[PDB]
Design a protein around this ligand. Structure first.
Ligand SMILES: Nc1ncnc2c1ncn2[C@H]1CC[C@@H](COP(=O)(O)OP(=O)(O)OP(=O)(O)O)O1
Ligand SMILES: [Mg+2]
Ligand code: NA
Ligand code: NA
Ligand code: NA
Ligand code: NA
Length: 538
DNA sequence: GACCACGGCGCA
DNA sequence: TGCGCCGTGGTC
């Protein structure tokens, strides 16, 4: 059972970290298991040099830490990836363990033994599941290596810039805070939604609109505040206060404190088994939700910069989820729009909601986007009218004139739900699965909620599969050009390239992304270059 | 000190 | 539709 370090090749690794973040963790223990024997490493760090590959639960995490120490240790087989492909609700080692025959403990040796056992059991369950096997070998397993390099590389942050911006925003916050209190006739904690509720609906005469989900309090959400924007001067200042405090507390203040001492850069984690649809997630810190939609947000984007002598290259799949819907549904009108190379939102703004596409004003185009997104998420005419500043009836029509112009989308949604009810799951173009039991619920509200989750997954998940595949293909090509892949934001990639190669890099990555997997419609990629994330965007 | 539920909101 | 993080108001 107990055998001296080192282990034979192909052994499963087990390791304990002082904390969950690979880039910040002390490696406390390092074990390995193979053929019914466990090898525990006398000194974890030195023991790392003996390994040729990290095979086991949470492989990437160990690879990231290895890369941190200047070791080129790649992640290989990971039972978590197998489990997640079988059922995307398999997101943690704790859960996967109890489910497939072990216990996730806090000891390296037991973790190595667990990894071996779980892999054997899980690999057998993936026999016959050829499409999931293809996903594992061709996408998830290789992807884990790409992600490990991204995590270890990190991205550069203009700290002094954010420090200065912080002091600016702090001053503006105090003005709004002072005004709000003037209008309230007294100070209170403006960050407390409970105290705000009292002030708005009880102390001021403002009418409550909706209520909160769990506790049933009168909501003070943006949707509610926006509707009361001209019911009282205090509202506008509260909306602005919300924006500034959100951005300051979430990005401006925390980010500078997260710079790594060795790298001088910011290192997120790209979670590979975290979502029900097949998307990645980002945490510690989350870099897939850096602001950009507001002025202040854009000034925050500017903080993410290229290394000196380098440029950022930002690549973005144009309307990918819509293109994927065109393919999956086979709707002629939708397919023709993309094949003719037309702006789908502009076309959507003419095909319905009047005419003609020579064209529509910009405010009309966002109207079309709202509809499209709405269809994507199964948004009711209610929330659509509230999202469109138009009477409820005006929204109902807009939704109908949509399914008139793109009939096969309707047929596709109905077909997807029917098959989901029979099989108990839905799938992406590549066969990635999400089980959706509640399609058979006897409570309409629950059932319908489940339906929206169900038919959306094939779209969101196919777009995720495509991006993942693209990253897998793109990565080796960048390596050979001396370029870096830094971040992924669902439909977008951010790279780093030497100034002199930035053009060549952008051209190559663009073409690699557009040709990732030919569909019934072309994939168009928009690319931008700049010294910071904002100026690199379009 | 850590952790929780909630409402709220940042991004795709 | 899918995430992860914030402060509040709390518990332990
Ligand atoms: N405000 C919002 N609300 C909900 N979902 C949103 C969103 N913004 C984006 N998404 C979702 C849906 C799409 C995706 C981001 O795509 P783009 O925002 O770039 O819209 P695209 O289709 O490319 O039209 P373009 O104007 O760019 O031509 O994330
Ligand atoms: Mg876009
Ligand atoms: Na991992
Ligand atoms: Na139904
Ligand atoms: Na989606
Ligand atoms: Na090569």
């Amino acid at each position: 059972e107990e055998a001296p370090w080192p282990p034979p090749e192909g052994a499963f690794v087990g390791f304990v970290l002082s904390r969950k973040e690979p880039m910040w963790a002390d490696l406390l223990a390092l074990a390995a298991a193979r053929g019914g024997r466990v090898h525990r490493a006398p000194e974890p760090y030195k023991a790392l040099r003996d390994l040729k590959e990290a095979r086991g639960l949470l492989a990437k995490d160990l690879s990231v830490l290895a890369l941190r120490e200047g070791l080129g240790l790649p992640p290989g087989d990971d039972p978590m990836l197998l489990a997640y492909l079988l059922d995307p609700s398999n997101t943690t080692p704790e859960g996967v363990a109890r489910r497939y025959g072990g216990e996730w403990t806090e000891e390296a040796g037991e973790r190595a033994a667990l990894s071996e056992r779980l892999f054997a059991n899980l690999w057998g369950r993936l026999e016959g599941e050829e499409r999931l096997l293809w996903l594992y070998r061709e996408v998830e397993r290789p992807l884990s290596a790409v992600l490990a390099h991204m995590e270890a590389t990190g991205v550069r942050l203009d700290v002094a810039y954010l420090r200065a911006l912080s002091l600016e925003v702090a001053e503006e916050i105090a003005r709004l805070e002072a005004e709000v209190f003037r209008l309230a006739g007294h100070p209170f904690n403006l960050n407390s939604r409970d105290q705000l509720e009292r002030v708005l609906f009880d102390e001021l005469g403002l009418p409550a609109i909706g209520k909160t989900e769990k506790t049933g309090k009168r909501s003070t959400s943006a949707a509610v505040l926006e509707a009361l924007r001209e019911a009282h001067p205090i509202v506008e200042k509260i909306l602005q206060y919300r924006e500034l405090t959100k951005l300051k507390s979430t990005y401006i203040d925390p980010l500078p404190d997260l710079i790594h001492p060795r790298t001088g850069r910011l290192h997120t984690r790209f979670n590979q088994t975290a979502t029900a649809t097949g998307r990645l997630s980002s945490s510690d810190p989350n870099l897939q939700n850096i602001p950009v939609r507001t002025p202040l947000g854009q000034r925050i984007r500017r903080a993410f910069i290229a290394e000196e002598g380098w440029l950022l290259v930002a690549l973005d799949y144009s309307q990918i989820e819509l293109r994927v819907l065109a393919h999956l549904s086979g709707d002629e009108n939708l397919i023709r729009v993309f094949q003719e190379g037309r702006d789908i939102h502009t076309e959507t703004a003419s095909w319905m909601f009047g005419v003609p596409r020579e064209a529509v004003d910009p405010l009309m185009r966002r109207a079309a986007k709202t509809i499209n997104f709405g269809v994507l998420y199964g948004m009711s005419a209610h929330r659509l009218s509230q999202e469109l500043a138009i009477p409820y009836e005006e929204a109902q029509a807009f939704i109908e004139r949509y399914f008139q112009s793109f009939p096969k989308v309707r047929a596709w949604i109905e077909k997807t739900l029917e098959e989901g009810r029979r099989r108990g799951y839905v799938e992406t173009l590549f066969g990635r699965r999400r089980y959706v039991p509640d399609l058979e619920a006897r409570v309409k509200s629950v059932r319908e909620a489940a339906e929206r989750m169900a038919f959306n997954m094939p779209v969101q998940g196919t777009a995720a599969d495509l991006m993942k595949l693209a990253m897998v293909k793109l990565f080796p090509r960048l390596e050979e050009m001396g370029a870096r892949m830094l971040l992924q934001v669902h439909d977008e990639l951010v790279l780093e390239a030497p100034k002199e190669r930035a053009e060549a890099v952008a051209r190559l990555a663009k073409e690699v992304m557009e040709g990732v997997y030919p569909l019934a419609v072309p994939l168009e990629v928009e690319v931008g270059i700049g010294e910071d994330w904002l100026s690199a965007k379009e």
